[PDB]
Amino acid sequence: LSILMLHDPEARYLHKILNLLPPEYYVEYPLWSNVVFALANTSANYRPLAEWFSQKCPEKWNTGGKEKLEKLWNDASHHTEKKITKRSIMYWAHKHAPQQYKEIVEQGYFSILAEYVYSYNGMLEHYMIAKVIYAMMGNKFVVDVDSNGKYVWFEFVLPGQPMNQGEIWKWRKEVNPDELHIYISENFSRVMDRITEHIKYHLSQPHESNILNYYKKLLKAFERSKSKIFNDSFKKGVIRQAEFLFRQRSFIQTLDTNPHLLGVGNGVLSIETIPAKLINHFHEHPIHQYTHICYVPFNPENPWTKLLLNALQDIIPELDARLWIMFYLSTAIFRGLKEALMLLWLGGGCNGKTFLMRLVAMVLGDHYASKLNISLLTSCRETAEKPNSAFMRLKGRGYGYFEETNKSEVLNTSRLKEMVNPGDVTARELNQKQESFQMTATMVAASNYNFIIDTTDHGTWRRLRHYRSKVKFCHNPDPSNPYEKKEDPRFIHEYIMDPDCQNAFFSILVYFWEKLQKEYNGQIKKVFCPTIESET
Amino acid sequence: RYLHKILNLLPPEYYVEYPLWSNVVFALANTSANYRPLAEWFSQKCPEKWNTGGKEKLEKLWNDASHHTEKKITKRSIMYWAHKHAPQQYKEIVEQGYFSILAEYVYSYNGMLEHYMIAKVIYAMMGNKFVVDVDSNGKYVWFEFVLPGQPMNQGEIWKWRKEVNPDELHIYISENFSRVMDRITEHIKYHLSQPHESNILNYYKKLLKAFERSKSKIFNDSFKKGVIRQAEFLFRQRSFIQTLDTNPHLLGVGNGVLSIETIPAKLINHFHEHPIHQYTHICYVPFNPENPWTKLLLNALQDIIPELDARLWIMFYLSTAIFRGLKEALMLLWLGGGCNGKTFLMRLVAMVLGDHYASKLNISLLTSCRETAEKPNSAFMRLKGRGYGYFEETNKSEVLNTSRLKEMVNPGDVTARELNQKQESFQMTATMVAASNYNFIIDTTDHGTWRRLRHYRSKVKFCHNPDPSNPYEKKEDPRFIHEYIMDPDCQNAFFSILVYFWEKLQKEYNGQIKKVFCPTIESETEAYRKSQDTLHRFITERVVESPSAETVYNLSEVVTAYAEWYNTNINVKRHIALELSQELENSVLEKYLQWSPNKTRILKGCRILHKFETLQPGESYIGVSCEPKNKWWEWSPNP
Amino acid sequence: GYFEETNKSEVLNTSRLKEMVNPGDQMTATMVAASNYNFIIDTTDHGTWRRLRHYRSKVKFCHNPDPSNPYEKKEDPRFIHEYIMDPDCQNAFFSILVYFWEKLQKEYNGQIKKVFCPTIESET
Amino acid sequence: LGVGNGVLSIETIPAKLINHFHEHPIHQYTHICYVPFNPENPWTKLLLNALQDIIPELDARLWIMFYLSTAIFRGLKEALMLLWLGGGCNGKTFLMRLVAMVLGDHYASKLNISLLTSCRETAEKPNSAFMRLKGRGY
DNA sequence: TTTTTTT
Numbered sequence A: 001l002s003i004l005m006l007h008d009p010e011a012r013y014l015h016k017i018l019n020l021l022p023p024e025y026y027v028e029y030p031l032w033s034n035v036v037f038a039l040a041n042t043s044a045n046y047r048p049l050a051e052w053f054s055q056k057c058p059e060k061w062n063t064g065g066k067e068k069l070e071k072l073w074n075d076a077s078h079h080t081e082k083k084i085t086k087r088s089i090m091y092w093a094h095k096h097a098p099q100q101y102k103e104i105v106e107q108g109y110f111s112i113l114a115e116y117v118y119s120y121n122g123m124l125e126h127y128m129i130a131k132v133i134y135a136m137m138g139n140k141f142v143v144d145v146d147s148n149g150k151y152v153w154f155e156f157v158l159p160g161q162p163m164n165q166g167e168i169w170k171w172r173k174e175v176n177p178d179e180l181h182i183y184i185s186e187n188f189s190r191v192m193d194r195i196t197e198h199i200k201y202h203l204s205q206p207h208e209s210n211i212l213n214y215y216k217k218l219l220k221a222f223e224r225s226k227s228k229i230f231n232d233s234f235k236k237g238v239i240r241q242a243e244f245l246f247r248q249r250s251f252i253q254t255l256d257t258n259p260h261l262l263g264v265g266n267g268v269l270s271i272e273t274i275p276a277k278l279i280n281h282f283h284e285h286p287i288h289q290y291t292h293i294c295y296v297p298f299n300p301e302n303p304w305t306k307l308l309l310n311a312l313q314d315i316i317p318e319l320d321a322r323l324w325i326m327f328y329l330s331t332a333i334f335r336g337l338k339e340a341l342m343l344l345w346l347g348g349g350c351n352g353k354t355f356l357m358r359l360v361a362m363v364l365g366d367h368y369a370s371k372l373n374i375s376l377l378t379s380c381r382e383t384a385e386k387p388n389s390a391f392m393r394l395k396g397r398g399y400g401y402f403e404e405t406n407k408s409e410v411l412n413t414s415r416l417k418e419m420v421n422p423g424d425v426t427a428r429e430l431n432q433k434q435e436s437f438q439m440t441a442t443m444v445a446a447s448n449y450n451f452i453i454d455t456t457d458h459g460t461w462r463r464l465r466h467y468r469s470k471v472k473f474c475h476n477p478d479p480s481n482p483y484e485k486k487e488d489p490r491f492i493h494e495y496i497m498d499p500d501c502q503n504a505f506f507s508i509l510v511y512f513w514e515k516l517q518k519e520y521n522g523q524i525k526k527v528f529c530p531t532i533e534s535e536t
Numbered sequence B: 001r002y003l004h005k006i007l008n009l010l011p012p013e014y015y016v017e018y019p020l021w022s023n024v025v026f027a028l029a030n031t032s033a034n035y036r037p038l039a040e041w042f043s044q045k046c047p048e049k050w051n052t053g054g055k056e057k058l059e060k061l062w063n064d065a066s067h068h069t070e071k072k073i074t075k076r077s078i079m080y081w082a083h084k085h086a087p088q089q090y091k092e093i094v095e096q097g098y099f100s101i102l103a104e105y106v107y108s109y110n111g112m113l114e115h116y117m118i119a120k121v122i123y124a125m126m127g128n129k130f131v132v133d134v135d136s137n138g139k140y141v142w143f144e145f146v147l148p149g150q151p152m153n154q155g156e157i158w159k160w161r162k163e164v165n166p167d168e169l170h171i172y173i174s175e176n177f178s179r180v181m182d183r184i185t186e187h188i189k190y191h192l193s194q195p196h197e198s199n200i201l202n203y204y205k206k207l208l209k210a211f212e213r214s215k216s217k218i219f220n221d222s223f224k225k226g227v228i229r230q231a232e233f234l235f236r237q238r239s240f241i242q243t244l245d246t247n248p249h250l251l252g253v254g255n256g257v258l259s260i261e262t263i264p265a266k267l268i269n270h271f272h273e274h275p276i277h278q279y280t281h282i283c284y285v286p287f288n289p290e291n292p293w294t295k296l297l298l299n300a301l302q303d304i305i306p307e308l309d310a311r312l313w314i315m316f317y318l319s320t321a322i323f324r325g326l327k328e329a330l331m332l333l334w335l336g337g338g339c340n341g342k343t344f345l346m347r348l349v350a351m352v353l354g355d356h357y358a359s360k361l362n363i364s365l366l367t368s369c370r371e372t373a374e375k376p377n378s379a380f381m382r383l384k385g386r387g388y389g390y391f392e393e394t395n396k397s398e399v400l401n402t403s404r405l406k407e408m409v410n411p412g413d414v415t416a417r418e419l420n421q422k423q424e425s426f427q428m429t430a431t432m433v434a435a436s437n438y439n440f441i442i443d444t445t446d447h448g449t450w451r452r453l454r455h456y457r458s459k460v461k462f463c464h465n466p467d468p469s470n471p472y473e474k475k476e477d478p479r480f481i482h483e484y485i486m487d488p489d490c491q492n493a494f495f496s497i498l499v500y501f502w503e504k505l506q507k508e509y510n511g512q513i514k515k516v517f518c519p520t521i522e523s524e525t526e527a528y529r530k531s532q533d534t535l536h537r538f539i540t541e542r543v544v545e546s547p548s549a550e551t552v553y554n555l556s557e558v559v560t561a562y563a564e565w566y567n568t569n570i571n572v573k574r575h576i577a578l579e580l581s582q583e584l585e586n587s588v589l590e591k592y593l594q595w596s597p598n599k600t601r602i603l604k605g606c607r608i609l610h611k612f613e614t615l616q617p618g619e620s621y622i623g624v625s626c627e628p629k630n631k632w633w634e635w636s637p638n639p
Numbered sequence C: 001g002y003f004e005e006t007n008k009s010e011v012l013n014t015s016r017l018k019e020m021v022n023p024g025d026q027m028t029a030t031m032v033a034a035s036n037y038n039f040i041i042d043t044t045d046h047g048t049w050r051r052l053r054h055y056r057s058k059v060k061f062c063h064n065p066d067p068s069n070p071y072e073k074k075e076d077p078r079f080i081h082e083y084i085m086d087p088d089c090q091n092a093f094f095s096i097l098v099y100f101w102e103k104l105q106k107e108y109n110g111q112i113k114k115v116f117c118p119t120i121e122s123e124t
Numbered sequence D: 001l002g003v004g005n006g007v008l009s010i011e012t013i014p015a016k017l018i019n020h021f022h023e024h025p026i027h028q029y030t031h032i033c034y035v036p037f038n039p040e041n042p043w044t045k046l047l048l049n050a051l052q053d054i055i056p057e058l059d060a061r062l063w064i065m066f067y068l069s070t071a072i073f074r075g076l077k078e079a080l081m082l083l084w085l086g087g088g089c090n091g092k093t094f095l096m097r098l099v100a101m102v103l104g105d106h107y108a109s110k111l112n113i114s115l116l117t118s119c120r121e122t123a124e125k126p127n128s129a130f131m132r133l134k135g136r137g138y
Numbered sequence E: 001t002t003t004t005t006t007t
């Protein structure tokens, strides 16, 4: 719901005061409505009644009594003879607990800035306004140091924002805090103006003995320092000093490490419990990478879902083989340690390869899936200090597919054991240090003739699976042959590029993952398919 | 004088106990490199037993302490002891100590403050928590000692962490330092409140105006950058990065520093002066067999290795992976058909040791590829400061070279570079374990090579579905690799097991794995060395004692026959005619090998088969043709 | 400079023997190469063979059985393990090296070809 | 030619030693100082006797000395190459090294026989040693 | 640190 909106820190400021109010307003009608009326007089933008619902009980005084208070708020928002100021709310907060009121208000943004202004005679520096900016904007930005030793910014993206598609409810990477710079020359300028008005009020007080000359000196110095907010070097120094306040020590190493959370085009998909849920609100899970596909729950009545299921029935005629292949491809959405399995798909001519495997790759995106070259499997390995950037193309992804065969390639079994087992793999990123990571990828290879397995040990044959396509796609020359069917080029030209088709296929994959988690205990060896076993 | 006050807050008990007295004496010797504050501390603690006499004996004891204990105790230990014994008194004195320095600078420079002044004050009040040193690239690097209440990464407690920038020190300047700066302002106001006299308040007014002008520089970014740049010369310790992780008896762990200097191993979870930077994520708990994870792991260890003596040997061998010092030149080959839990053990040891202390080494470094040592070669930098290396790759029955097996096994010195690094030299300190699926073929018969090689055969299979009544085949577990090796509690239990076995090795024997008696291992190694002698097999197979035979066999004929025999029976490979001649010369052939009138080695009679069968019937051929009772972890200390 | 690592009976090029022994362009290193099997010298040049000296050791250090042959003795491994890393042993050996340098400078005029040793000449 | 005591000018006979201010741009040099030829110098007499010993016949000695004297000139010269052959301990490897040493690193260089014997390649490969005789006369 | 060029 975002009861304390990150774009408005005055909501948090007022929620602290509403917590500070006595608990006599809790579970009662009359004075609760009086404070609601006063708060709507001060600011009628659905914020303070939401803070009332958050801090205190929303409707414990009367269940279903929300609409009466909404109508009272509407009557307050319309022209109202009485107009209660916020000073009544400060008076009630001071009446309930003076020391707690004082302790609450020292941590506010305005009090920090005013304390700096009064204690340093209107001279404002980088750390002071960096501290105020962190106080009022600290939940939306974060800083961390990467492997190269540079401070990197991250911003949480909210629905109303000039946002790149699919970035909502996630942390996006920033080389510079673009939003913070504008905020300093805009939102911060507004609060600076409030401090100017406060100084003018204290100037309007009587002269007393000598305080009025000090007040005019303070006003002159603060008016001199107020222009520094729009200066480029000052803003750069403020942002440089703010990197030590916005710093979170273990943010980058935690950034994409939960394999049960998947960034999607409308939020974060959580597959921790069945059924999978869509987090499209504020949360504390660090999520940076995503896929462009939006998650809609699986519904077979969707025309795209129906078309895709009919296509799946077309590609694999055997029911058990179709169920096994769907269960295997559903595990591509998981980026954790999975079972040591590998599927080899063999097809003669125009078959379902490059439509199905490419569909899985396009619904998972570049961060979660990749296309790999067959030189990683067939050619002999390179000396490990050479920076193999193709081997780094499966670091944090749960899906990989090979697609090229020259003429009955012979695959290196050492690379097969290295890239399939649930262990650690060491490799060097280009122009970077040699490092070890974890194998979390579901791997599929499509061939045209065959693969030669030189060895006959139990190690390479307990992790190898084989399937041969029984359907030939020849539209023009489609005979009575049952395994022969007429093709549509749209499946390779338009349907694989269509976002609705991709959304439907992603829903199918999530449904099959949940089916595997429900019927079995997520273990794919228990999937009893005689066709795949006999072909192997 | 400040340190004299710190010594004055020390209790009289520090002269009651002799070792604590000597520790403080050595600490003061590291402070002053003389005996003047040492003599002041002698007079403060005890002016009355030895009195003036024995002062030369006190200098002798100072010289003896300065050449002892190998660990530099310095100011920070005394400051910590003063905090522990007199915390409130410790809070004061220092509170005014830097306040006075700052006051001296303010009064002697008329309130105009610069980078070096506040850098000196900041060093006076944070010198025990930060350090600066120059690395190999010529850059000044900061290190911060991590305290328990801190925004701290996991496992970093009670250690030195590397900081690109002293972020904490920057905040300290705009926060803690600003507070002491205020105290100065309150002091100036007191002087101004004091009567003007002649123009003293005029001075206070001028000094005040200048100080309030310069007080706002503490929050300026360029000023703080200049202060931090000036503090790099004050926080600098000249031998820090070189000494950073060099004690092999100290190991960084997730709850502090584990010390295996003295049995039993101790967890330092308080202040210390040991330089420790690297660590493992595993927290150390003392060994307890009643723990369910520990009991499960010990059951797996008993089930994997059925004989007790070999189980004790491999456990004593793998316990030495926690030591990063000089160990015996050893290499263990574990051979099995991929159906045993040998592979479960190596990944477990690597995971409880971490990436700083263990690494995975490909078999390419032993089989074919040569060491460059002129390119970057980041792969050979993966055993620089680690105590464990395991080979977990076998393509198809790899043949390992003798040169690499003599290069990286013996405790010598090796030289390599890395990215942005020069050709630096380091020491081999890693316990090495190689997994074999098919076979390892030792092409030599060298006495020095075979003294460092150990072999043990896997005897237990594991299968998923069928699980027959075979005594040597049991059922596998889906979790043992997928869940039980990711679990932190299982890793903690296994690390406790490793520390217990290291302590057992140090107790029953003098840390030498040669003195450990395992007759099974000796019998297997002798059998493997007999099976790896291809020359003996060739002589037994193709050379038969032909009585009254006039067949003339010069070494060249034997060399050619053996070369065909080796290439045909063993892997095809090139041979040295001369070296082969010497090899066949040193064998039973000597009995039937004699010089010729032309001085040429010849084999009298002894017709060679030259083919299958075709052997001489006459004169036959030439080639001669416990139990664990209750707990297995502990055993006979003196079998 | 020293060569120690012998895999299997290394043959050695006469070119590099000519290049890296001669005082060409600057070589200032005393060079020792050790082997366990053989060095294959493929030449018969007089200029190459005069810069080569050969010595064959006559002592084998036996640990376990220790027979009573005068040319084999009982050894301790500490000489490789502990005694080479001790700073006091290193100081003593450096003192020995300096003493023998002074002895060479005194008894001869710093020329090692003037040192008379029939064993080395006979073995070479 | 830059020399250790100034500039040697061989534009006219006799060669002159510029040891004062001049407008000739000269950066590289050799460490050898130039003294005029004097056969009564003991080192010069020793070297002339060594040259008489190494090459016995007079005409070949004069020819080889004339050919080696053109190493101090850094311009276009005749297309010639001398092949000096011998059995054993000869005067070779001392005379050629002497010419290289008196000319220095800028004005002379040592080339390996791999430049001549074999392994001419496609010029994608750099061959790593052909600019070792960029601007030197020997 | 790569390109290279190791070959």
Ligand SMILES: Nc1ncnc2c1ncn2[C@@H]1O[C@H](COP(=O)(O)OP(=O)(O)NP(=O)(O)O)[C@@H](O)[C@H]1O
Residues within 6 Å of the ligand: A311, A312, A314, A315, A347, A348, A349, A350, A351, A352, A353, A354, A355, A473, A486, A487, A488, A489, A490, A491, A492, A493
């Ligand atoms: N279920 C389907 N129904 C109808 N047409 C299909 C179906 N699946 C694929 N096609 C078409 O079949 C054609 C073959 O393309 P493609 O799938 O790339 O062949 P391929 O076997 O994967 N690769 P290749 O064998 O080298 O040509 C494409 O034009 C697709 O549009």
Ligand SMILES: Nc1ncnc2c1ncn2[C@@H]1O[C@H](COP(=O)(O)OP(=O)(O)NP(=O)(O)O)[C@@H](O)[C@H]1O
Residues within 6 Å of the ligand: A421, A459, B299, B300, B301, B303, B304, B337, B338, B339, B340, B341, B342, B343, B344, B462, B474, B475, B476, B477, B478, B479, B480, B481
């Ligand atoms: N002590 C044990 N008792 C029973 N099963 C075990 C034990 N240790 C390991 N296993 C099982 O045996 C297998 C060992 O893991 P694995 O990664 O296959 O190494 P591996 O035996 O060498 N197989 P491979 O790498 O192909 O040679 C897993 O399935 C474990 O569940």
Ligand SMILES: Nc1ncnc2c1ncn2[C@@H]1O[C@H](COP(=O)(O)OP(=O)(O)NP(=O)(O)O)[C@@H](O)[C@H]1O
Residues within 6 Å of the ligand: C046, C047, C048, D049, D050, D051, D053, D054, D086, D087, D088, D089, D090, D091, D092, D093, D094, D095
């Ligand atoms: N003029 C000379 N008078 C006497 N000795 C000389 C003279 N010139 C050279 N030598 C010596 O003769 C030896 C020949 O060595 P060197 O100058 O290398 O000729 P070389 O042909 O290269 N010998 P080699 O390397 O076997 O082919 C050296 O010891 C020289 O010092």
